[PDB]
Structures are given as C-alpha cells and as structure tokens.
Amino acid sequence: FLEQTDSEIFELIFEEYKRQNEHLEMIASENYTFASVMEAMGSVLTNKYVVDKIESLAIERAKKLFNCQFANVQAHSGSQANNAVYHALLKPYDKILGMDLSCGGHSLTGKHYQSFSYGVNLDGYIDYEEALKIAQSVKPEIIVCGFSAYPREIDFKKFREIADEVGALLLGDIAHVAGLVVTGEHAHPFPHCHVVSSTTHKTLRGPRGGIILTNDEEIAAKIDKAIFPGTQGGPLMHVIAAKAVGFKENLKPEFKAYAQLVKSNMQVLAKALKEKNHKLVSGGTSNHLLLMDFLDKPYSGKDADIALGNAGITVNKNTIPGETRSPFVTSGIRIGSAALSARGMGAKEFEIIGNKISDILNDINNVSLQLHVKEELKAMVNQFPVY
Amino acid sequence: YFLEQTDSEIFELIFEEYKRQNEHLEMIASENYTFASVMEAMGSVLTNKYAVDKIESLAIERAKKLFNCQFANVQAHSGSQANNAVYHALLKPYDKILGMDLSKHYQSFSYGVNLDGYIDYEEALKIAQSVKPEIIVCGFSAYPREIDFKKFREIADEVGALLLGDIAHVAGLVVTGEHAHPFPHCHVVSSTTHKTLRGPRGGIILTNDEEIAAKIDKAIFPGTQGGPLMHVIAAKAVGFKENLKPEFKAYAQLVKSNMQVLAKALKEKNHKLVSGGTSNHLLLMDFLDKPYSGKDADIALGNAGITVNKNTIPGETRSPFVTSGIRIGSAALSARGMGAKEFEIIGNKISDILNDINNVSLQLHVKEELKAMVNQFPVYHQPIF
C-alpha cells in the first residue's frame, strides 16, 4: 500500500532493494537482515509503550545464545553498549586499554577517560607480551579486547590473565565476530570477560542495536541504571521483538553452518589472493575478514577501494601495521565475507571473486577490465538473490 | 508471514498486542495508531542500508512544507532528545532554562498555572524578568488549552531569551490549523513524530533561522548514535506526507470535535474539569474535593476497558504516585473513526464508574458493553506489514 499512497518513497525503497541485489557487498560490517526481523520491525508493536513479556523473551534468548547470566537488550548501538559499560564500571579519568593496528608505536584523551593502546606483532598478531608490559606500566582500570580490522581470533583467556595480574576489568567487544562467537566458530568470551558488549546486526543479521552481557549480578545491576532511559518514555518494543527474533534465528543449527560458511569462504578468498601473490596482514585469516597489504605496491589502499567499487565490489580502505601513507588513503583494504555468504554464495563464487579481485589490482589502472568484471559479477550476484 | 512459521512465540506476542489494541478503548493522550504505510517503511530493506541521502532530503523537504518552516532536522530519535539537542547547540554550560510545570550543566526554572487552570502569562513574565533565562520553553504534556506563542515571544524578546516551542503533544493539531501556530514567533521548534502526528517514534527540530539550523546539525552530528536509520527516516517522510492530505485535517478536527463531546458530557454529570474544558485533544478531571484518587480512577476504568492515566492537577493535595486527576485524550480513538455517538456513550459510562468507584462488578459489566462498540471500529486489518 506504499505503492498507492507514497510513490516517491516507494521508488526509493525499490531503488535500494535493486541496489542491494546488483553488487557484491564485501564490507565487513554490512549484511542482509533476516526477513523475519524486518517483519517484527514493521509490526504493530511500534504502538505499545515492570517487565514486559517481550524484553524477557529477548533477554532469555540472549542469555541462552551468548551463554551467560544477565543481558541488557536496550542499547541502541554498538557504541552505546561500549560507552554504557564505561559509565557503569568506571569513574572520571580512569584509564582504558584497547586495541589498534599499529606495531610498537605505543596518556591520550577519551570522553572523560584516558585511552591507552596495545598493538600487534611484526606478524600481524596481537602482541600479548607487549600488552602485559603496557598493562603493567599503565595499570588500567579496564582492558578492551576486540577490533574491527583484526583478521584473527582474540584470545579472551590470555587477556583475563593480563587483567588478573594487573587488577583490571576485561571488556569483551565481540561486535565484529559475534556471529562466529555465538556458534562456537570463535573463542567464547565467557567466563574470561567480566562484561561483553556487541552489536545485534553485522554477523548476527539482527536489527540494528547493541547488547550487554555479563555473568556477575552486581555488574548487571549497574548496567541497567547506566542505560537508564534511552531518552524516551517508550521502550521501542518492535525493535526489541526484532532482537528476540534475531536471537532465535542465531540459535538454530542452520546459523552455525552459516558461520562456518562465512569463514570457509574467507579461506577460499584468502587462498585465491595469495596464489596470485598478494600480501595479507598476518598472512591470512581466521575470521570473517581479511586485510590486504599494499605497503610494497605502487598503488594505495585508497586506489584499490575506488577501483574495486568501479567493478561493483564494495570494500573498505583501512590502515595497516607499519602504515606509510596518510590515514585518508591508507595502505590496505578490508574485505568481508558475511554479506555474500548470507546470499548463499559458496566456494565456487568466492574463488572467481578472488581472482577477479587479483586481476584488478595486478592492473590497477585498467578501467575497461574493471568494467568487464563488473558486468561478469552482476550476472553472478543476480543468480544469488537476497529475499 | 515468516514469523508464523519461523517464530510462533514472538508472533504470538505480536498478534496479542494487535488483538488488544481493538479490545480496549485507548484514551492516553500520548498514545495513537501509526499509519499502516509508516510501518510498511519501517520494515523495508532500508535497514541494510548503512548510510546526505536522497531519503533524508525527501524527509526534510516534507517537514518544511508540513510545518511551514525554512529548516528541519529529522535525525532526532525522540522528542526528548530533540529538546536536549536544542539545549546543547544554543546553551553554554550553567545556562538557564524556563519551562512549564503544572504548578547537563543547565539550571531549570518553572512557570505555572493560575487558579482558573490557564497559563498565567503575567507571572511567566515576572519570573523571566527575574531569572533572565537564555531560553524559554512552551509546550506541556498535560495542558488542556492552546499555547499563546505570540505572547511567549514578547516575554522572550523582552528579556533577550530564545523561544523554544515544544509542540510535541499538539503537533497533529498545529500542522492542521486546529492549533495556534508556533511560527514565526518561536525561534526554534521541537516535536515528536508519533502521538497526534501518527508517524513513527522519533523527534524533529524546526527553525526559520539558518545559523540556528546549522548548530543543530552539528549537535546531531555527535549524537548521531551509529546511524543514520534509513528505515526510520523513510518512515518519517511517509507520515509527513499522510499529514499533508486533507484527510488529516478532517481527522484533527475530529480529535477536538470528539474531545468537546466528551468534555460536555462529563460536565452535565457535575464532574469538574481542569480549566473548565478543553481547546485540545486532551482533558483533565479534577478530583480535588472528592473522596477517590486519580490512581483510584485510573485503576477503576482500566479494569473497565477505558485506558487513561493518572495525572497531577494544579493545587494538588495527594502524593505524586497517587494523584487528584486523570488525563483523558481523544486522538487514538479518533484514528479508529469513532465519533460523537461513541464519545457520548464514553462519558456516561465514565460517570457511572466514577460515582461508584468500588463496584468491580459494574466495571467488568461496562467492559463487555463497550468492547462490542470497539468491535465495530477496527484500527488495522493486519498485524504485520
């Protein structure tokens, strides 16, 4: 009935749905939401405004899915989740240790905290020994593990060893691998982490929001008061019901297959890139993503992002360890598997995808090549429709 | 519907809420039934779109034509976050705010209500001369009459304050011409997109000053909160376009039309209303000199199908969690199409239960009679879109 009342909005929705169908989304953060989730998102629950039956069911499935004791499913974003943990567990000017991708470069500012950083190996792996050294120097009130551009598994255990020695808290931000964590395709953060924050979209393919989890009753109580309003007299029930719908789909064993599909596709893509002698940070991936490395190549990370978009492949420029160039051109790119794997695309496609990528960056200024593969890939993605 | 197959527990709760919206009479002033098309955009593939946009631009333009202003910001997630975004864009810390009550670093002061139940503009002037606020705020959740923006500008312009009209509770009436218009008297206007507007839940900030409009955009830049939610902004544009139709002006007259019928009916059964009536979508009963409480009245009719809330009234005797008044709104039942015939019946059923407030048998009896009335006024035909 949008086709009858609002023509202009309807053309914009169809424009978008055709736009999602006719390109390869390989940005690591992007995915296609469960159809069932959009259904709840567009229900009469937007009308309704002391526990509600629906946030219970969301918290119930949240606890079962993430294997924990308490859950706050009211965070509006992955950033609020992290920020809400900070207000609940810290005091002003408390120190915060977190990850970046520098190598050895490590008092910096926060919203009203002090941020310190630990980095990675010369092998692109997290340097845990260096982290304990920094943790012993800084003596931080909290440590954050988790990172958007990290191509490998995080060792939540070794981090709790560093936090126990230093007398710190351990926040697990699994917002980028929650799909892999939830299905056993990634080290679980519990019981090593005092708190876990995460986004409910991305790899979990739920609605857009945050979630907070913990096994400690006192932390759960403070998280409830820190989230406090959402600044609204109404808890948005349709979004919460959408959250519970997304959690039940994540518990299905079909989702566990999706998760290993996401990782094996990444394995195919990474293998296909190296066989043509491209360089990946840490030499590969154990993740939903890889990071190409262009430090010793004529073109930039900016250059490859633009070129590959011209071919209809949406990727992500990203700085890498040992960054030579400016932060707004960078020396790498960050490619994701989770979007195509939700389409049902398997190993055969991601290998063709892998060489079509290799062909374009081995010839970064061949505009006609980029255009040939764009049409060649639009016909593939047309064979694997979303919805 | 996938949800019936894939998740019957959630669908059970969705169909339960939809069945309930047609099982009781909804009379909370702030509650209403969003347009069926708005919910259709809420569940679009626009969720997957992580990112100004053609859709954001179309929402802003419809906002300017619906609210008759030169600028609009659609990125607020609630009427409250829209107010706070205005304060944080225009006020340094320790600045002063003067807003209405029912008798960050910012300091709040209040104006109030005279004995008649109307805003007292003479006192509101005297408090603004003394406090010297940097912003005066109109708009109030439980006021039964029209806000005189033109006079609030005179108070603001006399003391050099900004005027913020908060038309969130009266927005459907303003953009229809059934309420005084906040422009161009108010320097800046805030509102919700639900309640009387019948759109999705969220906020809107309006202004005819460009340098104010630029500060707001930067205050929404930090409070963006990981968006923008393209399905929600697309929903807001859908509601604005239904609000421009002449069907909406017909509706907003019904909301006042029905509220006059009900207010008239309560008075001829010798019930006291705050300010003696309404110019509005809403009405407040006065139980000051009465043996029962606003909580007692709420619980009473709640168990009779009529969903109202308890409310403070000027010169309150009882606690805050017990009150001396109830607030009765008219918009949600008007969206169902109920008219003067139904709203007349409502008033007398309210008296019968208000004058025998502890007859639980009368309450369950009244609930069965008016649920057959509500059976003949469906709100939607579908639970999901």
Author numbering:
A (entry chain A): 4 to 52, 67 to 123, 131 to 411
B (entry chain B): 3 to 53, 68 to 119, 135 to 416
Give verbatim lines from the article.
In order to obtain structural and functional insight into the H. pylori enzyme and address the weak PLP binding observed in purified HpSHMT, we solved the crystal structure of H. pylori SHMT at a resolution of 2.8 Å. HpSHMT crystallized as dimer, like the other known bacterial SHMTs, and no evidence was found for higher oligomeric states in the crystal packing. The HpSHMT structure displays the typical highly conserved overall fold of type I PLP-dependent proteins and is formed by one large and one small domain. Despite sequence conservation of these seven loops, no PLP was present in the HpSHMT structure, providing one of the very few apoprotein structures of an SHMT enzyme. The two active sites of HpSHMT are separated by a distance of 24 Å (calculated between the two PLP α-phosphates), which is considerably longer than the average distance of 18 Å observed in most SHMT structures. This illustrates a modification of the HpSHMT dimer interface, where one subunit is rotated about 17° from the other in comparison to PLP-bound TtSHMT or EcSHMT. Remarkably, loop 1 is completely disordered in the two chains of HpSHMT. Surprisingly, the PLP pocket is found almost pre-organised in one subunit of the HpSHMT structure despite the disorder observed for loops 1, 3 and 7. As a more detailed view of the active site indicates a very strong structural conservation of the residues involved, we propose that the structure of HpSHMT represents an inactive conformation of the enzyme prior to PLP binding.
